[PDB]
Amino acid sequence: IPVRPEIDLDPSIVPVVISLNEEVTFFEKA
């Protein structure tokens, strides 16, 4: 896996931070 350790004062900007399963599952249970 291409980890690229080169000179860096700063860290690399982190990667910035559908799916209705358990909701309809609650409706099943209800």
Residues that bind other proteins (CB under 8 A): 1, 3-15, 17
| Residue whose CB is less far from other proteins, 7 or 30 | 7
- Kindly report the three-state secondary structure assignment for every residue of 1-30: CCCCCCCCCCCCCCCCCCCCHHHHHHHHHC
- What Cα–Cα distance (Å) separates residue 11 from each residue in 6, 14, 27? 11, 8, 45
Residue 25 C-beta: closest distance to other proteins, Å: 14
Smallest distance, other proteins to C-beta of residue 16, A: 9
Closer residue to other proteins, CB minimum distance, 15 or 27: 15
